[PDB]
Amino acid sequence: SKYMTPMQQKLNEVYEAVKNYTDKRGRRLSAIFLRLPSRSELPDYYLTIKKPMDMEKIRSHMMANKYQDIDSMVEDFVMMFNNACTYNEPESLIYKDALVLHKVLLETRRDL
């Protein structure tokens, strides 16, 4: 087992910022984003969304050293939040959490 490369460390910092973000009430907005439900459980997502994405897929790719740069991981998160905001309506909580975590993601990015 190798120690994470310098790029994996920067990737991990972006990942953790999104994962660990809590609002003023202590709610961890990433909770619902960690693992997509199954096709059986959320069939309409799978009919609507061309490229499924969850944080577990991203974490696994990160830990495999498969991201070539920071922006490739950012793209996957952006895809995830866009999927969420396409499938769900602006009035839903998951939509608004996505917008908040999308902001958190870009802020973390700007600061690298």
Ligand SMILES: Cc1n[nH]c2oc(=O)c3ccccc3c12
């Ligand atoms: C539930 C649910 N409902 N709608 C969703 O959109 C998503 O993009 C997503 C991503 C990771 C985990 C769950 C979801 C999701």
